[PDB]
């Protein structure tokens, strides 16, 4: 999997 941070917001792919 992968952890994404987009301008402070956390998401998982």
């Amino acid at each position: 999997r992968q952890l994404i941070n987009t301008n402070g917001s956390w998401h998982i792919n």
Partner: antibody
Framework: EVQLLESGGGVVQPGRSLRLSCTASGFTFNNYGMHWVRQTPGKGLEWLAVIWFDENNKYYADSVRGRFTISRDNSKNTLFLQMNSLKTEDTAMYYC????????????????WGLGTLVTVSS | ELTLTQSPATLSLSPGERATLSCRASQSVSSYLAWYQQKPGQAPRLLIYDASNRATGIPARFSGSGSGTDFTLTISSLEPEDFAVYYCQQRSNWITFGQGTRLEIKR
């Protein structure tokens, strides 16, 4: 039982570097994201960095980005925090913490903490 | 820049009573809020995550609720071990912590 063992604390001079380590036992380390968080009585708890399942997948607080590096060696079950260009303001208790890591669909919460390593930055 | 503010700063109670703690965010964090307990000279312990979910092994006497900018932790049937500091944490935008609420023994 779940265990996070941190390196012992001590003193380091301003400007120098210091690498902290945290070694996991009692669970499958590779399956968990990990974090470093520090604490001072004056400024409270401050998150510093996360590393996810893939060892190249990392994030950092604005305050330490480009100064600190987080890394993991899965074969040794060890998490590192490499701190460079240390200032007296970096004096703190340094905790490693395990992320809840998608267990029950949750992430970016600290479900297990080490006892901490006390770092004193002083000349 | 997201700030969490905890109240009361200090709570004075006796074992067996109920504590009610509050965490307020400067802007909405949806349900992205957790609560930690920290006993003196020890590591923090995760109590509640996603505002209302108990961490594995955490007793129901720790109960979390709220959303947006307003959150509450209640601790029922206080135990001797529960007199400690409690912190909230958001993960809506980066990761920040409240400044803590101190629970002490009334006399």
């Amino acid at each position: 039982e779940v265990q996070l063992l941190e390196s012992g604390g001590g003193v380091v001079q301003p400007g120098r570097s210091l690498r902290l380590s945290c070694t996991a036992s009692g669970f499958t380390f590779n399956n968990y994201g990990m974090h470093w968080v520090r604490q001072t009585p004056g400024k409270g708890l401050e998150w510093l960095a996360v590393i996810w399942f893939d060892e190249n997948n990392k994030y950092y607080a604005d305050s330490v980005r480009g100064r600190f590096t987080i890394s993991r060696d899965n074969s040794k079950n060890t998490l590192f925090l490499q701190m460079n260009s240390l200032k007296t303001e970096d004096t703190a208790m340094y905790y490693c913490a395990r992320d809840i890591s998608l267990v029950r669909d949750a992430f970016i919460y600290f479900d297990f903490w080490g006892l901490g390593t006390l770092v004193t930055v002083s000349s | 820049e997201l700030t969490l503010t905890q109240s009361p700063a200090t709570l004075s109670l006796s074992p067996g009573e109920r504590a009610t703690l509050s965490c307020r965010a400067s802007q909405s964090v949806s349900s992205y809020l957790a609560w930690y307990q920290q006993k003196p000279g020890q590591a923090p312990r995760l109590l509640i995550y996603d505002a209302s979910n108990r961490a594995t092994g955490i007793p129901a006497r720790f109960s979390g609720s709220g959303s947006g900018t307003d959150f509450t932790l209640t601790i029922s049937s206080l135990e001797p071990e529960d007199f400690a500091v409690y912190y909230c944490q958001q993960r809506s935008n980066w990761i920040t912590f409240g400044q803590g609420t101190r629970l002490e023994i009334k006399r």
